[PDB]
Design a protein around this ligand. Structure first.
Ligand SMILES: *CCC(=O)N[C@H]1CCC[C@H]1NC(=O)c1sc2nccc3c2c1NC(=O)N3c1cnc(CC(C)C)cc1C
Length: 270
């Protein structure tokens, strides 16, 4: 209506129903939009985000739409704190979901989670949009068990320097390729590397990558050409796919289109 652009949600249209917890940007709630539609609401804690830059980018993100990508519905910007409104993912983040042993996953289900994420990443790649921080902690699970990619691109607007450079105590070292750690060279191939680590997290049921190492030791391990190794639940064919994401030379890593074909082949063969 009057006063709200196409990227802007009227917060008065929101009904807050349940607090989901607190993340890095702040509190996340479950609610309804105009009484009928499930939504997630992330309340951006003040001082945490580059808000004017994020809002301009939110206008571009409104045009990103894919079955396996968490849908941005809009932002609430007239106020502090601002809200990010999205489709609701009832089973929470993939990381905690993988760690609940009660699910007793079949490997067929684990590969489907990889395929879910890979389709979303191929879509983002087809739009020349880097995620820049892909990890199981960022993927979400809906009430049907479908995995979708979330938080895409948001690291660009984080003001806490501990998060934004490899020198920082909160940088995702364990998801980063050597050229990121050594030179800060981000590209589609640093998303590819992180996807390989995500595949490892999935088949490891949510273990920390390099769980016996510090970040500093992980960087040295990776820099010397050493890698994660095969999770007990990964077949040889599955391990070949995730390992292909970790070529020291970025240009020898596959695209998300090639990974998708490889994953579909293994689904057929297994
Ligand atoms: C393992 C990670 C974890 O523990 N997360 C916790 C942070 C607060 C409580 C936990 N979060 C959630 O359970 C959920 S459920 C859900 N559904 C939809 C969206 C989200 C969501 C969360 N947390 C979220 O942060 N989001 C969310 C993600 N990404 C964006 C950005 C846009 C462009 C997609 C927005 C939201 C609301």
């Amino acid at each position: 209506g009057l006063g709200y652009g196409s990227w802007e949600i009227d917060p008065k249209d929101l009904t807050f129903l349940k607090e989901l917890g607190t993340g890095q940007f702040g509190v996340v709630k479950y609610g309804k939009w105009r009484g009928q539609y499930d939504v997630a609401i992330k309340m951006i804690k003040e001082g945490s985000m580059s808000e004017d830059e994020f809002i301009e980018e939110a206008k571009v993100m409104m045009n990103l739409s894919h079955e396996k990508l968490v849908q941005l519905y809009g932002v609430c910007t007239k106020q502090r704190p601002i809200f990010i409104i999205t489709e609701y993912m009832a089973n929470g983040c993939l990381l905690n979901y993988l760690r609940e042993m009660r699910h007793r996953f079949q490997t067929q289900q684990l590969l489907e989670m990889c395929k879910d994420v890979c389709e979303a990443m191929e879509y983002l790649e087809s739009k020349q949009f880097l995620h820049r921080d892909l990890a199981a902690r960022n993927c979400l699970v809906n009430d049907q068990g479908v995995v979708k990619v979330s938080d895409f691109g948001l690291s660009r607007y984080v003001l806490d320097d501990e998060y934004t450079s490899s020198v920082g105590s909160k940088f995702p070292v364990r998801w980063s390729p050597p050229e990121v750690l050594m030179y800060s060279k981000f590209s589609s191939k640093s998303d590819i590397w992180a996807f390989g680590v995500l595949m490892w997290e999935i088949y490891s049921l949510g273990k920390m990558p390099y769980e016996r190492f510090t970040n500093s030791e992980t960087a040295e391990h990776i820099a010397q050409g050493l890698r994660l190794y095969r999770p007990h639940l990964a077949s040889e064919k599955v391990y070949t796919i995730m390992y292909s994401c970790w070529h020291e030379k970025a240009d020898e890593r596959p695209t998300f289109k090639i990974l998708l074909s490889n994953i579909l082949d293994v689904m057929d063969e297994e």
